[PDB]
Amino acid sequence: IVRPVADFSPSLWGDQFLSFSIKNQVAEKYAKEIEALKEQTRNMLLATGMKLADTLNLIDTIERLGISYHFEKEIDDILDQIYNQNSNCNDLCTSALQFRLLRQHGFNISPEIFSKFQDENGKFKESLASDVLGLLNLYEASHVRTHADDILEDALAFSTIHLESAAPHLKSPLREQVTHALEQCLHKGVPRVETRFFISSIYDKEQSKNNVLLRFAKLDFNLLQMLHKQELAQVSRWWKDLDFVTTLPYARDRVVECYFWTLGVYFEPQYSQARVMLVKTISMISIVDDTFDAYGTVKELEAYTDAIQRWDINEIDRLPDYMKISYKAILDLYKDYEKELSSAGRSHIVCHAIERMKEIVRNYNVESTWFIEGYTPPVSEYLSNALATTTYYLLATTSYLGMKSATEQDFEWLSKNPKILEASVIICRVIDDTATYEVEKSRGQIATGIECCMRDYGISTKEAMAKFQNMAETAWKDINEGLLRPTPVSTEFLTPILNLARIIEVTYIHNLDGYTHPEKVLKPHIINLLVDSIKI
């Protein structure tokens, strides 16, 4: 009873991450200077007598430099004051920046601030077209709108068309920043990679840059990168010791890409343990996906699914040898989770991620059944199954395991599929389906997202893809709304969900996937985040 073909490619990375030894003297040097620079920066933020525009530009610069996580309380205190005071700036640049920064931090500033910039017909004054800084900040702000922000409904188009027109004659690095913005907006980018671009490509080249902030940003980035490299080394050894690339030769060898995903979810030092836990789940679920997608028979897949629901090592005899391997590994991983959380007294919350694993395996099996039967469900039924198979319910849940602050109440909220989680999952689903359609259409998939859509609504491939794009647009507004205070849980637990939506947009940018193993899209970001340090 034959199997498919060894179609996947090996890891292009070889063993270059397997061992990293931190030059402890260099790390301590960096850490010591950063401490001094951190305090100088804190004093900049706490300086009195600053004008609004200067204050917002300082916060914006520090956030783009990737060092705002050092100043969460200070920044919040300042934005909170700005929110509460009657800000009457009549310039497009400052208004739009004020709007963006406040909204991104959950402050529900009214979009009425943009009215003065529009005619009686609610359309932006074309006379703004010669204000590039205003256009740029309006552009960035337009990506943070909610359903209640229809005054901004054309801001994206307006600013885009005029930025395009102005870009080639702008000075550097403003030109590069505008051109980059048009390709990748700040709000929907992966924070470490926008940070890397801003530091090296923009701020390092800005005539007016603050030397203290630039040096701070460079040292902090490179020191954090050291931690990330230690983590990836530890994870690479863990993966190598599992030796799935030998025992399960049908499976993808992509632990570097999996680790990069965790880096998108959170990069800060306090989430080191969290990333190491998360990456192991991402690696293992890609094994499961592949087992379902191109190796297991119907009968094998049904026993696998059943064994997962029972979740007992006793069940392993009921499986073929090759499934025994991943099944034991899955059970071991969660017992490992329980042990490393027991000292903190948080072993009891591992069950929540276990339930999501059980869930996605059920839905994998449904997807297989559908495929075997040649079933094309209506979109509603399709999504009822296919949202879970994005892995995003599992990943979001898993992201909390290593977060010391995460409580049972936080897991209970997540367990109900709150709107902001649903939105992120939907974004991942429709982006994947748009990119996967043409290739999977030839692979025999009758139950692919776009096909379900085409058949349900009786529309073309283009119309279906536009309907899917609209779903993603709607979901981004939902995410944006879901960040607004008062939040149902602490914002610390929302940002992973937002960041999950960010990575998938970035990974499938410009279409499609992108193409052939999203590795090609990820490769330069992995180089920039995990191989090459920022030259100082």
Ligand X SMILES: C=C(C)[C@@H]1CC[C@@]2(C1)C(C)=CCC[C@H]2C
Of 252, 254, 346, 356, the catalytic one is: 252
Rounded to 5 degrees, φ, ψ at 313 are -60, -20
Among 94, 104, 363, 391, the residue binding ligand X under the rule CB under 6 A is 391
Task: Find where tokens 């996906």 sit.
Answer: 289
Asked if 286 is part of the footprint of ligand X (rule: CB under 6 A), the reply reads: yes
User: Which CB atom, from 194 or from 519, has the smaller least distance to ligand X?
Assistant: 519
Q: Which does 436 bind (CB under 5 to 8 A by kind): Mg ion, ligand X, none?
A: Mg ion
User: Does residue 261 touch ligand X according to CB under 6 A?
Assistant: yes
Q: Using the rule CB under 6 A, is 254 a contact of ligand X? A: yes
Known active-site residue 215: no
Interacting residue with ligand X among 519, 526, 529, 530 (CB under 6 A) = 519
Q: Which residue ranges make up the annotated binding site for (2E,6E)-farnesyl diphosphate?
A: 252, 289, 293, 429, 432
**Residue 368 interacts with, from ligand X, Mg ion, none (CB under 5-8 Å by kind):** none
Catalytic (active site) residue 94: no
Residue of the chain from 101, 258, 454, 472 that contacts ligand X (CB under 6 A): 258
Q: What is the DSSP letter of 198?
A: I
Residues 30, 139, 261, 476: which is the catalytic one?
261
Burial of residue 299 (number of CB atoms within 10 Å: 0-12, 13-18, 19+): exposed
Helices (H) and strands (E) in the chain — how many of each?
A: 23, 0
295 CB-near residues (< 8 Å, 6+ apart):
3, 4, 250, 322
* By the rule CB under 6 A, 530 interacts with ligand X: no
Q: Which residues are annotated as a binding site for Mg(2+)?
A: 289, 293, 432-433, 436, 440
Whether residue 216 contacts residue 65, with contact meaning beta carbons closer than 8 Å, is answered with yes
Within 10 A of 101 (CB to CB), how many other CB atoms are there?
25
Cα Rg of the chain, angstroms: 24
3-state secondary structure (DSSP) of residue 80: helix
Q: Say whether 41 is catalytic.
A: no
Window 272-311: residues binding Mg ion (CB under 5 A): 289, 293
Cβ-contact 169, 133 below 8 angstroms? no
Q: Is 175 designated active site?
A: no
Per CB under 6 A, the segment of 42-50, 174-182, 280-288, 336-344 that binds ligand X is: 280-288
Residues ≥6 apart with Cβ < 8 Å to 30: 219, 222, 223
| CB nearer to ligand X: pick between 58 and 285 | 285
Chain positions 392 to 431 lying near Mg ion, rule: CB under 5 A, are none
> What SS3 class is residue 124?
strand
| 365: contact with ligand X by CB under 6 A | no
Q: Which residue has the tokens 């705002």?
A: 68
Identify the CA nearest to 436 among candidates 465, 472, 474: 465
List phi, psi (to 5°) of 15.
Answer: -110, 20
Task: List residues near Mg ion by CB under 5 A.
Answer: 289, 293, 432, 436
Instruction: List, by residue number, the catalytic residues.
Output: 252, 261, 389-391, 429, 432, 508, 513, 515
Task: List residues near ligand X by CB under 6 A.
Answer: 252, 254, 257-258, 261, 282, 285-286, 391, 507, 518-519
